[PDB]
Amino acid sequence: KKIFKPEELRQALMPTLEALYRQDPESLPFRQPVDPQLLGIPDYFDIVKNPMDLSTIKRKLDTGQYQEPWQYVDDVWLMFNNAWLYNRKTSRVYKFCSKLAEVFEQEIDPVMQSLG
Ligand SMILES: COc1ccc(CCc2nc3cc(-c4c(C)noc4C)ccc3n2C[C@H](C)N2CCOCC2)cc1Cl
Numbered sequence: 736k737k738i739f740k741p742e743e744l745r746q747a748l749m750p751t752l753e754a755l756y757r758q759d760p761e762s763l764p765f766r767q768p769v770d771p772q773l774l775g776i777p778d779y780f781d782i783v784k785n786p787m788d789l790s791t792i793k794r795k796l797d798t799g800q801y802q803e804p805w806q807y808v809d810d811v812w813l814m815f816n817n818a819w820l821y822n823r824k825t826s827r828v829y830k831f832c833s834k835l836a837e838v839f840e841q842e843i844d845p846v847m848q849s850l851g
């Protein structure tokens with residue numbers, strides 16, 4: 736299998752993570768982990784078995800926790816799939832998620848090609 740230095744993944748992928756963060760207000764619900772107590776939604780962790788958010792992805796990328804770049808792609812799509820699963824299609828959060836996913840799909844393709 737192919738070997739990737741943590742520093743190579745960090746430098747290559749950080750611009751794509753910035754592209755998500757800079758979407759305002761769409762990234763705001765995704766910048767920190769969903770807090771079901773604060774939001775009053777105790778069933779969140781029953782429906783969403785594997786929570787994910789931008790802060791967790793950013794920490795994994797900054798600290799060298801990904802073995803290969805498709806694991807970062809996996810985490811980003813997990814984040815988006817969790818939001819589309821939990822929230823109504825008509826809801827703000829679902830629509831914000833769809834904006835972020837549109838940004839991500841545009842940005843991630845050339846980066847993954849260059850990482851080989
Ligand atoms: C700016 O955008 C919003 C602002 C408020 C709401 C309703 C309340 C809220 N409703 C939220 C819903 C989610 C969420 C996600 C993401 N997936 O399932 C759920 C539920 C996550 C966070 C949510 N939050 C917290 C939001 C983002 N605040 C954080 C601190 O500063 C002000 C805004 C929704 C949105 Cl989309």
Ligand SMILES: Cc1cc(N2CCOCC2)cc2[nH]c(-c3c(NC[C@@H](O)c4cccc(Cl)c4)cc[nH]c3=O)nc12
Binds near residue numbers: 809833848
């Ligand atoms: C593009 C796209 C759109 C939507 N929309 C939802 C509703 O609104 C309209 C469409 C949902 C998606 N779900 C996923 C998805 C993954 N994609 C990989 C892709 O990024 C990718 C694939 C090959 C190479 C590269 Cl470089 C990147 C991977 C794992 N699990 C996933 O669910 N992709 C979706």
